Amino acid sequence: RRKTRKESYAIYVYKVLKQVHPDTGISSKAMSIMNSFVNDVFERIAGEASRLAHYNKRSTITSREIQTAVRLLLPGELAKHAVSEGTKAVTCYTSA
Amino acid sequence: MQIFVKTLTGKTITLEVEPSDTIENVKAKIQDKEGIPPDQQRLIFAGKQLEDGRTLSDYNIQKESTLHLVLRLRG
Amino acid sequence: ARAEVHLRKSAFDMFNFLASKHRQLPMPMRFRHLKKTSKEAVGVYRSPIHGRGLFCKRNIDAGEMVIEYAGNVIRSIQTDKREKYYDSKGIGCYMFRIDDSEVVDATMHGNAARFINHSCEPNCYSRVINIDGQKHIVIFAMRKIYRGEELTYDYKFPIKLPCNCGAKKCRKFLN
Amino acid sequence: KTRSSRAGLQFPVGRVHRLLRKGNYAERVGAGAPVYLAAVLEYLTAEILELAGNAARDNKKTRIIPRHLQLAVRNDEELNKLLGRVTIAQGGVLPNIQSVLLPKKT
Amino acid sequence: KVLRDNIQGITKPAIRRLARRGGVKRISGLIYEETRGVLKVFLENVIRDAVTYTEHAKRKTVTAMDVVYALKRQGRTLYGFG
Amino acid sequence: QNYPEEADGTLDCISMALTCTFNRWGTLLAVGCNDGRIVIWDFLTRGIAKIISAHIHPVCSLCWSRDGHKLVSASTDNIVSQWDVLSGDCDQRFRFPSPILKVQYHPRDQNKVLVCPMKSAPVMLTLSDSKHVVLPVDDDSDLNVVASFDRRGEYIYTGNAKGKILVLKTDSQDLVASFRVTTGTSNTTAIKSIEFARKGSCFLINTADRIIRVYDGREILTCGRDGEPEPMQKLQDLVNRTPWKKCCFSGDGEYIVAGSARQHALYIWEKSIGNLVKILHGTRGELLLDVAWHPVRPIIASISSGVVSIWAQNQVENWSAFAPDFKELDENVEYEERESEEDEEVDVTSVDEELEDSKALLYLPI
Amino acid sequence: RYRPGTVALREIRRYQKSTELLIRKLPFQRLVREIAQDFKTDLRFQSSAVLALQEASEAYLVALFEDTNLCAIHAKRVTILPKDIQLARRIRGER
Numbered sequence: 001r002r003k004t005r006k007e008s009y010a011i012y013v014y015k016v017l018k019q020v021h022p023d024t025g026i027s028s029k030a031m032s033i034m035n036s037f038v039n040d041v042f043e044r045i046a047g048e049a050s051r052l053a054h055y056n057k058r059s060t061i062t063s064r065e066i067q068t069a070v071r072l073l074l075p076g077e078l079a080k081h082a083v084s085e086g087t088k089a090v091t092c093y094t095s096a
Numbered sequence: 097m098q099i100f101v102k103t104l105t106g107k108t109i110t111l112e113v114e115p116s117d118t119i120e121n122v123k124a125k126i127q128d129k130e131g132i133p134p135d136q137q138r139l140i141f142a143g144k145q146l147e148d149g150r151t152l153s154d155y156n157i158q159k160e161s162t163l164h165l166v167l168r169l170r171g
Numbered sequence: 172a173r174a175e176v177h178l179r180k181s182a183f184d185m186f187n188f189l190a191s192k193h194r195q196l197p198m199p200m201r202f203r204h205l206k207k208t209s210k211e212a213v214g215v216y217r218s219p220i221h222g223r224g225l226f227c228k229r230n231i232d233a234g235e236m237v238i239e240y241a242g243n244v245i246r247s248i249q250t251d252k253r254e255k256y257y258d259s260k261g262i263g264c265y266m267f268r269i270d271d272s273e274v275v276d277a278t279m280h281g282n283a284a285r286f287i288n289h290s291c292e293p294n295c296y297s298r299v300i301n302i303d304g305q306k307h308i309v310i311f312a313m314r315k316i317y318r319g320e321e322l323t324y325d326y327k328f329p330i331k332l333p334c335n336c337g338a339k340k341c342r343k344f345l346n
Numbered sequence: 347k348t349r350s351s352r353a354g355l356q357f358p359v360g361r362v363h364r365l366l367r368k369g370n371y372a373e374r375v376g377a378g379a380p381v382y383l384a385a386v387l388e389y390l391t392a393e394i395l396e397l398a399g400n401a402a403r404d405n406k407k408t409r410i411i412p413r414h415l416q417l418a419v420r421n422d423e424e425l426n427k428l429l430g431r432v433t434i435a436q437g438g439v440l441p442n443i444q445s446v447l448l449p450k451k452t
Numbered sequence: 453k454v455l456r457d458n459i460q461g462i463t464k465p466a467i468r469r470l471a472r473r474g475g476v477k478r479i480s481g482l483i484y485e486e487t488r489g490v491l492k493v494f495l496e497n498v499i500r501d502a503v504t505y506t507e508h509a510k511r512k513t514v515t516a517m518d519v520v521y522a523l524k525r526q527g528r529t530l531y532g533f534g
Numbered sequence: 535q536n537y538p539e540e541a542d543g544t545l546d547c548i549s550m551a552l553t554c555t556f557n558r559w560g561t562l563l564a565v566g567c568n569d570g571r572i573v574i575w576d577f578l579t580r581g582i583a584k585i586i587s588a589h590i591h592p593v594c595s596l597c598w599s600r601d602g603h604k605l606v607s608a609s610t611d612n613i614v615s616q617w618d619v620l621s622g623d624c625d626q627r628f629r630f631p632s633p634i635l636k637v638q639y640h641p642r643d644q645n646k647v648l649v650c651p652m653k654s655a656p657v658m659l660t661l662s663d664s665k666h667v668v669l670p671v672d673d674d675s676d677l678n679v680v681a682s683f684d685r686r687g688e689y690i691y692t693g694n695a696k697g698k699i700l701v702l703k704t705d706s707q708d709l710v711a712s713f714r715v716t717t718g719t720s721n722t723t724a725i726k727s728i729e730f731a732r733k734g735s736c737f738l739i740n741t742a743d744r745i746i747r748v749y750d751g752r753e754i755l756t757c758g759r760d761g762e763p764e765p766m767q768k769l770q771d772l773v774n775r776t777p778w779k780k781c782c783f784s785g786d787g788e789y790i791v792a793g794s795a796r797q798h799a800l801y802i803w804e805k806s807i808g809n810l811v812k813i814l815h816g817t818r819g820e821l822l823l824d825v826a827w828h829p830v831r832p833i834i835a836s837i838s839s840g841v842v843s844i845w846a847q848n849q850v851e852n853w854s855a856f857a858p859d860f861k862e863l864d865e866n867v868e869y870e871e872r873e874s875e876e877d878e879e880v881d882v883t884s885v886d887e888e889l890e891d892s893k894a895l896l897y898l899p900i
Numbered sequence: 901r902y903r904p905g906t907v908a909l910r911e912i913r914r915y916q917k918s919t920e921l922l923i924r925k926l927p928f929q930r931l932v933r934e935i936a937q938d939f940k941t942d943l944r945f946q947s948s949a950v951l952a953l954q955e956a957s958e959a960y961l962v963a964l965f966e967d968t969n970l971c972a973i974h975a976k977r978v979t980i981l982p983k984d985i986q987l988a989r990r991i992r993g994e995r
């Protein structure tokens with residue numbers, strides 16, 4: 001009947017895959033599973049950060065609280081890599 | 097004419113600017129010359145403001161003058 | 172004592188590391204372990220059997236892929252000039268013949284597995300597989316490696332370079 | 347004018363900010379939150395997809411089937427620590443046989 | 453400081469009594485070391501989350517309510533501190 | 535080469551170590567111990583040189599002379615003394631009405647030392663006749679001013695505590711150039727300090743607006759009396775807002791390094807692109823005192839809380855260096871064999887950039 | 901052929917490589933229909949939905965088996981037994 005427009009993280013992860021391995025194809029099922037994974041991790045981190053922000057009598061969500069959340073949630077040296085990458089991204093973003 | 101573009105490291109570059117050539121074209125020529133993007137450069141004459149969307153004749157800078165090319169960041 | 176000439180002059184030594192201390196799943200995708208997790212389980216120390224050796228500070232049990240041997244792979248025509256240069260420079264018989272048509276020379280290029288010894292009482296046996304269309308030699312163990320022992324594989328030469336190891340079963344020769 | 351190119355990332359940032367604003371996680375958020383989230387999602391997606399491509403080229407198949415993703419996630423240890431209680435559709439299981447159950451003879 | 457001592461601070465009768473409250477009789481003499489090990493590996497995560505929480509709050513003392521908060525973050529909840 | 539990528543341990547010959555600095559290319563370490571003594575350690579050789587019984591009250595800063603024969607120390611008890619590198623005793627002794635922040639020796643004038651008195655104008659003390667010459671300043675004379683030489687020490691630059699920077703001559707003292715820092719958007723800002731390099735005449739400025747800025751020591755005498763501020767990159771930390779205590783320049787002239795206070799976040803950038811490249815992973819718990827790279831080779835060495843942490847490039851030559859005609863590499867290609875198979879009577883007699891900060895003449899093998 | 905225990909290893913490895921489902925579609929669909937009718941009557945199922953449940957089941961179930969496996973190894977035997985299943989179910993913390 002009436003067509004609808006839906007949002008999925010389809011184009012961006014595909015661009016990432018091409019940026020990394022510009023020789024390998026991807027399946028629709030893999031596309032949907034990656035979409036579910038990114039939605040899952042996004043909601044997990046955002047909710048944990050929000051409930052931490054409520055815990056501290058803070059009415060805001062700064063950037064510091066998110067890095068605290070990713071320090072808690074992410075284990076091992078992957079946490080260090082992710083937090084360093086995030087700091088790089090924000091520093092390269094601000095002066096622009 | 098001819099003017100000087102002084103950088104931060106200390107190297108001095110001499111370039112030619114016409115009386116009726118806009119600053120944007122000068123920056124494009126510089127970018128095609130040594131590869132430094134125009135977004136990474138801006139003109140300063142003795143600690144005074146110079147913009148990109150203008151022309152040398154609008155500022156009336158004398159010949160053989162030095163311009164402080166104070167470094168910038170990409171984007 | 173600077174006035175008496177001591178003997179054992181000629182050495183013809185190349186790897187000048189001889190010390191008196193010596194203080195020691197499907198097939199194709201196992202390539203990673205070759206290059207990344209294969210640089211700690213074995214140390215390089217003074218062998219007691221003969222010359223230098225690969226001692227051990229770790230433990231590896233039976234049926235475990237350990238090392239890939241690589242070197243200057245050449246054809247059999249270069250064997251003549253290679254042996255002449257071995258006689259000239261004083262080079263041992265590093266003619267690692269994977270087959271009668273290709274031999275792995277280890278006098279101008281080679282890997283850390285050039286440090287091995289031979290004995291009729293060894294610890295490991297050889298094996299070869301083929302990955303991605305290329306034939307590569309990888310060794311799988313039959314027993315456990317103890318801390319402080321040296322890797323050695325039987326050359327399987329059917330019965331003059333002596334084999335001085337001191338083992339009771341040691342045939343004293345490459346045979 | 348766009349906003350993702352300001353930091354050079356690839357994941358959208360305006361979309362993240364809108365979706366977090368309407369997600370009622372709080373009432374007021376700063377400016378670095380959306381870019382930071384886009385960055386961390388970028389890093390995690392790259393981490394997974396590189397192993398996905400490695401597994402794709404393992405079997406010499408261009409298309410990445412979910413079996414490859416299952417193998418890449420399971421064989422790593424940090425992922426198995428982080429993806430503890432999660433399964434995968436059509437994923438299958440990595441091969442494993444218990445050591446003491448291995449018959450042999452002369 | 454880092455000291456190998458005080459790790460044996462849980463001497464044998466304490467583990468004896470804990471085993472008794474568990475309801476066991478025959479315990480081999482080589483259980484104590486792995487009990488120490490499992491206790492340490494458990495306590496690591498909770499103390500680490502507690503110190504991260506207290507650090508984020510810009511104070512260098514730890515309360516009990518943040519401790520139970522971290523404990524609930526792992527999944528084991530405490531009742532009786534707020 | 536590139537930025538340091540390996541980590542080194544500590545270098546603690548004695549338990550306490552407050553300040554550190556390299557001489558010209560990292561020869562000896564000038565440790566001002568918190569006991570009134572002056573200890574000299576050995577760099578690139580991992581040893582000690584000399585211990586000097588200076589006085590009772592400990593010191594807080596150190597630098598060496600242009601000819602390397604003196605050990606100046608910004609004392610905490612106003613002992614402006616010229617300790618000898620050779621004998622270890624005091625050569626010249628003097629007292630200043632205000633303590634000293636930054637001591638330096640002009641690589642072309644060791645007679646006039648660098649002094650940064652507080653609430654008073656900088657004073658050059660001449661070692662030839664023990665005469666003090668006050669540096670003429672502008673406006674206030676009671677501000678927290680810091681004075682420092684340029685690359686060659688030919689011009690001296692001073693920073694005040696209201697927003698004013700002054701430029702004058704190291705010897706003639708012809709104050710003919712000033713500068714007013716930007717006033718943010720509504721409120722003005724003072725200056726904490728400035729720090730120079732050995733190539734390019736660039737210099738970082740640390741202010742009270744929580745933001746580290748960078749200028750060049752060539753746009754003030756060119757503009758004239760006072761112009762408009764125009765930095766290259768207003769670098770800062772926009773996720774934790776760490777204040778800045780001590781930061782030096784690179785050992786090559788193209789990098790910029792900045793130091794934290796307690797967060798163990800040592801940041802690095804390059805002058806060409808203001809994009810972060812790497813961050814240091816330091817163990818929390820200590821306060822950073824001094825940072826200064828190897829003036830030639832990329833390496834980082836930060837002193838803190840009596841100990842020192844070095845992030846470096848540990849290197850050992852490859853096994854394939856036995857001989858140029860001998861290599862120990864791996865290849866799977868067939869070997870490429872070779873394809874091309876006087877009388878004179880003369881005896882033999884033959885045996886960043888460089889500045890004049892040499893001739894320590896301090897080495898005791900026994 | 902003969903030598904029982906040899907064919908088991910070949911079968912288990914062959915199936916470990918494979919990654920297909922293991923339950924016939926129609927019987928499982930009818931069972932889900934019955935257990936739904938137990939709760940409420942006249943429920944229309946999405947063909948995608950049923951499939952969903954299906955996969956989850958095997959996941960859960962296979963995990964259980966593996967656990968029982970190691971439990972049998974703890975008892976100095978190879979064959980698994982019902983008692984080991986209650987062992988795993990109780991010790992997992994899900995009774």
Ligand SMILES: Nc1ncnc2c1ncn2[C@@H]1O[C@H](CSCC[C@H](N)C(=O)O)[C@@H](O)[C@H]1O
Pocket residue numbers: 218220221222223224263264265266285286287288289290332333334335336
């Ligand atoms: N125990 C031994 N005594 C004499 N020759 C040996 C030997 N073990 C191995 N060889 C010979 O030495 C050749 C390799 S060179 C020996 C390895 C290395 N140079 C080392 O110091 O240990 C082989 O071709 C083999 O035939």
Ligand SMILES: [Zn+2]
Pocket residue numbers: 334335336337338339340341342343
């Ligand atoms: Zn023998």
